[PDB]
Every structure is written in C-alpha cells, then in structure tokens.
Amino acid sequence: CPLMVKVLDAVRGSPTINVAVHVFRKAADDTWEPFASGKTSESGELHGLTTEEEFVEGIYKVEIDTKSYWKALGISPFHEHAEVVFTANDSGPRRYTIAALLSPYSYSTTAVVTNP
Amino acid sequence: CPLMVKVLDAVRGSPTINVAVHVFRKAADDTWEPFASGKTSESGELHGLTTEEEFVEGIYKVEIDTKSYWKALGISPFHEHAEVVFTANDSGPRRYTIAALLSPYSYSTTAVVTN
Amino acid sequence: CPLMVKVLDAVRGSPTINVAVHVFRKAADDTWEPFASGKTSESGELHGLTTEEEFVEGIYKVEIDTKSYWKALGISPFHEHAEVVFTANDSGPRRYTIAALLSPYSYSTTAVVTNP
Amino acid sequence: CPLMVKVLDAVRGSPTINVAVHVFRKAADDTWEPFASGKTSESGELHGLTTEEEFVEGIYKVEIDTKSYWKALGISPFHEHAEVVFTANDSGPRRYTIAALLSPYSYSTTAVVTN
Ligand SMILES: N[C@@H](Cc1cc(I)c(Oc2cc(I)c(O)c(I)c2)c(I)c1)C(=O)O
Ligand SMILES: N[C@@H](Cc1cc(I)c(Oc2cc(I)c(O)c(I)c2)c(I)c1)C(=O)O
C-alpha cells in the first residue's frame, strides 16, 4: 500500500463515504495517463490503489470528486474537485497518504510521507 | 493598527460578519485579563483593537465566538470558540493579522506578521 | 477509546512524535480541572486518554504543546499551543478524534465524531 | 476586479511575494486555455487579472506555482503547484478572491465570494 487517500467532511465532522478518486501519471509526452481510481470506504479511506511494482517514480495527480459529494448533500460547492499534483518516489520508494479536508468553499490537502 | 483580526466562513465562502472577538493579556498571576474586544465588520475584519503604545510584549489570547456564529446560521458546530494564544513582539513591534477560517467541525488560524 | 488525538507536521509531511497533550474538563465552579494527559506516539497518535465511564458529558479542553515541538526542531513558532474547546457527549456517548495539522505560523484542528 | 488571488506562507507568517499565478479557462474541446497571469505583490496579492466584460461564466483554473516558492526558500515541498478549479458566475457576476495558505507538505484554498 504505497498510496492511500483519506477524505473528511469539515461541516459534519465525519469521514466522506463513496467519494470518487482518480489518479493519473504524467506520460513521456507530457499528457496525463489514467493510473488508478476508486471510491472511499465508510472510514473515508481508499486503500489498494496500486502496488510497489506499479508505483514507479513520476509526477502523479490525484483528483477527488468533491463536487458530486457536496451536490448529493444538497450543497452547491465552489470547487469542481480537490486536486493534488506531486513527484513521487524520486529518492526511492515511499509510502504516501493524501488527506483532504473538505468544506463547500474551502479545502485543504496534506501529504504524510513515510519510509516503508 | 498593531493587531488586526480577519475571519472567513468556509461553508458560505464569505467574510464572517458580526462575530464577537475578545482579546486577553496574560497577567502576572497567570490569569487572562480582558484587553480588547469588538465585532467583525461586513468585511469580516476587526480593526482598532489596540494601539502601538498599549500593545507591549507579552502573551495574548484572541477568542473568537465561533459557536454563536454557527448558531445564527442554524448549523450545529463542534467547538465552543476558536482561541489563538501567542507571544507578541518577541523580536520587537510588528503588525499582526490573526486570520481564521471557520467550518462547523474545523477551523484554521494563521498569523500574518509584517514589519 | 472515546477520545483520540492525532497530530501531523505540515512542514515535514510526517506525524508529530512525542508532542505533549493535556485534556481538562470544566468543573461546576467554571474552572478547568485536569482530566488526562499523554504524548503522541511515532504514528502521531495518542490513544487511551480515557474510558467510556470516565468521559461523561461536559466541556473539555485539549491543549497540544506545539511550541515545544517547533522549538525542538529549531523553529520559533507563532502560537503557544493549539487548543480545542468543545462540548462532549451531550446527545449520548460519542467517539471523538481531534486531528491537528501544524505549521510554524498556522494550525488547523478538525473533529471526527462517530457513534460507537 | 472580478477576480483576486491572495497567497500566504504558513511557515514564515508572511504574504508570499513574487509567486507566479496562471489562470486558464476550459475551452470547448475541454483543454485549458491560458487566460491571465502575473506575480503576487509584496502583500501577496495579484489584482487586475481580468475585467468584468472578459470574465464570463465558465470553468476556470488558477494554478499557483508553489514549488518555485519553496525552492527559493530552500525547503523541499510536496506539491508541484496548488490548483483551484471552479465554475464561475453560476448565479451571476460576483467578486472572487481565491485565497491560498501554503506549507511545504500542505495547502488550503478558500474562495471568498462577495456581491
Ligand atoms: N484518521 C483520524 C481522523 C483524521 C486523520 C488525519 I491524518 C487527518 O488529517 C488532516 C488533514 C488535513 I488537509 C487537515 O487540515 C487536518 I486538521 C487533519 C484528519 I483532518 C483527520 C480518524 O478518523 O481516526
Ligand atoms: N482579505 C480577504 C482574503 C483573505 C482571506 C484569508 I482566509 C486570509 O488568511 C487566510 C487564513 C487561513 I487560517 C486560510 O486557510 C486561508 I486559505 C487564508 C487573508 I491575510 C486574506 C478576505 O478574507 O476577504
């Protein structure tokens, strides 16, 4: 589990359940190639996106579909998504947790990076 | 204005208007002595709390009554307030802006400290 | 485990290890009475502060000693501490996770509240 | 000024000065068309990006080059940038301030949307 995503709702104080998460990797030609995707569980976590073999060094993009989340709660939010773009594994393999904290007009994202 | 308070609402994307702010200074006996207070304006800002002459080095607390704000909006909040406690003018006099970003179950606070 | 505290360093992208956490409960006479204390583990978590029996409804204060943390890293931070003050268990027992995200001149705190 | 960008540094407690900001509008083919850009001022603010006449409804991206900022300071950052993507003027024309608070491993962004 080299890559995990954790998402929290700052309005309700609760994990964010069934939120779509897409991950992309920058290709040689500088386009984004689909890398992996999934939905958060009831703990607001998404595990198992990738493997140590698959998760090589590169620039990755994680886009969390915060708009669908807010809309399903009856709220028209400001952002289309929360996005995190980062260089991974450039000094060797690491483990990455991407945490996002969501409000209708604000979000924050944090990375927790550990050495396996 | 040595000390500036700016508050925003992360749910509505708006400044937080008319929220109470109390400033305390730590007294010798280690209790909080009320120092200054007011209400945020329509721009979410509270100016004129203190003066250069009055705002000496020491430890200060800024308490924002976030719970009354969420209560006015009909949204159940987690915190009783947001309080920011800091040592002032350690390296000399500066202009301080205490910014706070509010959500019902979360807040963040940031100090912007300039010349 | 009705009360857990989790603390992250936003400069280093890492859990915050050995940070002191004090919890107080407001007494009938409106003073703060020491309730519990501990230090974060290497996962930046502090478990076992209290029990369901002990953790009755009241107004609680969690103060995290962020100043000592930053100072031990050679940084002179803005805040004396990060504090969270909240009413607990007023609609029945809940489980509370208090997460704090720390930078030298900023912090955020979030509560995740679940129904056991 | 329909669109305002303000950036702060949570490590130093300061506005972030001279960081590059690029604004894009989503084109019909769904690629990002560069729209406006500049550098934040000494107050960390970028004004004058667009005008009322030019800033029509649509989907916009604001990209803040946070990685060059941390690089100038000698601090290893996590993100390549901070990017904020939003639908504009859904309910009509408004004044938008995109605020961002930066740390090496974390950022937050907030929209303040007024009359
Ligand atoms: N894991 C805990 C809850 C929890 C863990 C983390 I790690 C976390 O991380 C952040 C990220 C950002 I971005 C913030 O602004 C803040 I404050 C905390 C948050 I939130 C909540 C549990 O449910 O048991
Ligand atoms: N003057 C304008 C814009 C403004 C917003 C913030 I907000 C701010 O400070 C913060 C603090 C935190 I804490 C954040 O997470 C973020 I994102 C921005 C400052 I200086 C300026 C207004 O507020 O209308």
Side-chain angles (χ1 to χ4, degrees):
Chain A
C1 225
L3 178 55
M4 186 266 260
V5 181
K6 175 156 168 89
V7 191
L8 294 180
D9 174 336
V11 172
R12 301 157 64 186
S14 73
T16 251
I17 309 162
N18 285 329
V19 182
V21 176
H22 293 70
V23 187
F24 306 84
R25 191 192 172 271
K26 201 204 293 241
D29 69 355
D30 277 354
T31 60
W32 294 105
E33 292 306 332
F35 175 77
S37 66
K39 292 218 164 160
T40 54
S41 71
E42 75 177 56
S43 64
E45 299 176 358
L46 171 56
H47 293 266
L49 277 168
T50 195
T51 61
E52 293 225 60
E53 289 99 356
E54 188 186 63
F55 189 50
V56 290
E57 94 182 65
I59 296 175
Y60 288 81
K61 169 175 75 175
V62 179
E63 154 169 18
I64 306 169
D65 180 6
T66 63
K67 190 176 182 185
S68 296
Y69 175 81
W70 291 116
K71 290 301 210 199
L73 294 177
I75 291 155
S76 306
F78 181 77
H79 314 278
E80 295 294 302
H81 66 38
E83 205 176 345
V84 190
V85 177
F86 63 104
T87 301
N89 308 303
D90 68 352
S91 287
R94 296 290 188 272
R95 298 179 79 262
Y96 296 81
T97 300
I98 304 306
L101 171 66
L102 309 185
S103 307
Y105 275 67
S106 178
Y107 67 85
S108 77
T109 186
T110 295
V112 185
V113 181
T114 64
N115 209 143
Chain B
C1 223
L3 176 64
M4 301 194 142
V5 178
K6 172 148 197 114
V7 187
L8 305 176
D9 170 340
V11 172
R12 292 161 82 213
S14 74
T16 78
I17 307 171
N18 205 80
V19 72
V21 178
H22 287 272
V23 185
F24 305 84
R25 191 175 183 278
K26 193 167 206 139
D29 58 21
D30 266 24
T31 61
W32 289 111
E33 291 275 347
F35 182 66
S37 63
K39 247 66 184 212
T40 57
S41 69
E42 81 192 347
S43 64
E45 296 170 22
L46 176 54
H47 287 105
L49 282 171
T50 189
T51 62
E52 219 63 67
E53 298 70 29
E54 183 182 67
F55 193 55
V56 300
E57 296 188 305
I59 306 183
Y60 294 80
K61 176 171 65 175
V62 177
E63 198 150 85
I64 300 171
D65 183 4
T66 60
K67 187 182 190 195
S68 299
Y69 177 80
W70 298 117
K71 284 175 155 200
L73 293 189
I75 315 185
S76 209
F78 177 72
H79 309 262
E80 290 297 303
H81 50 264
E83 97 198 276
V84 180
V85 175
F86 65 97
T87 296
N89 305 316
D90 216 336
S91 305
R94 315 267 186 268
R95 285 254 278 170
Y96 297 81
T97 298
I98 300 302
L101 179 57
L102 308 185
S103 300
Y105 276 61
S106 180
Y107 68 85
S108 89
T109 186
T110 297
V112 180
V113 184
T114 53
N115 58 239
Chain C
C1 225
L3 178 55
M4 186 266 260
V5 181
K6 175 156 168 89
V7 191
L8 294 180
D9 174 336
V11 172
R12 301 157 64 186
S14 73
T16 251
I17 309 162
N18 285 329
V19 182
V21 176
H22 293 70
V23 187
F24 306 84
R25 191 192 172 271
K26 201 204 293 241
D29 69 355
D30 277 354
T31 60
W32 294 105
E33 292 306 332
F35 175 77
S37 66
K39 292 218 164 160
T40 54
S41 71
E42 75 177 56
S43 64
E45 299 176 358
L46 171 56
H47 293 266
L49 277 168
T50 195
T51 61
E52 293 225 60
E53 289 99 356
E54 188 186 63
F55 189 50
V56 290
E57 94 182 65
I59 296 175
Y60 288 81
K61 169 175 75 175
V62 179
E63 154 169 18
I64 306 169
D65 180 6
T66 63
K67 190 176 182 185
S68 296
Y69 175 81
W70 291 116
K71 290 301 210 199
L73 294 177
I75 291 155
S76 306
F78 181 77
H79 314 278
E80 295 294 302
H81 66 38
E83 205 176 345
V84 190
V85 177
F86 63 104
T87 301
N89 308 303
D90 68 352
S91 287
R94 296 290 188 272
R95 298 179 79 262
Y96 296 81
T97 300
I98 304 306
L101 171 66
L102 309 185
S103 307
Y105 275 67
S106 178
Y107 67 85
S108 77
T109 186
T110 295
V112 185
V113 181
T114 64
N115 209 143
Chain D
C1 223
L3 176 64
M4 301 194 142
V5 178
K6 172 148 197 114
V7 187
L8 305 176
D9 170 340
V11 172
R12 292 161 82 213
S14 74
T16 78
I17 307 171
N18 205 80
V19 72
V21 178
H22 287 272
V23 185
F24 305 84
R25 191 175 183 278
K26 193 167 206 139
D29 58 21
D30 266 24
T31 61
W32 289 111
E33 291 275 347
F35 182 66
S37 63
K39 247 66 184 212
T40 57
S41 69
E42 81 192 347
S43 64
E45 296 170 22
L46 176 54
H47 287 105
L49 282 171
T50 189
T51 62
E52 219 63 67
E53 298 70 29
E54 183 182 67
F55 193 55
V56 300
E57 296 188 305
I59 306 183
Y60 294 80
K61 176 171 65 175
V62 177
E63 198 150 85
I64 300 171
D65 183 4
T66 60
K67 187 182 190 195
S68 299
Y69 177 80
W70 298 117
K71 284 175 155 200
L73 293 189
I75 315 185
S76 209
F78 177 72
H79 309 262
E80 290 297 303
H81 50 264
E83 97 198 276
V84 180
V85 175
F86 65 97
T87 296
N89 305 316
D90 216 336
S91 305
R94 315 267 186 268
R95 285 254 278 170
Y96 297 81
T97 298
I98 300 302
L101 179 57
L102 308 185
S103 300
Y105 276 61
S106 180
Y107 68 85
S108 89
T109 186
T110 297
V112 180
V113 184
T114 53
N115 58 239

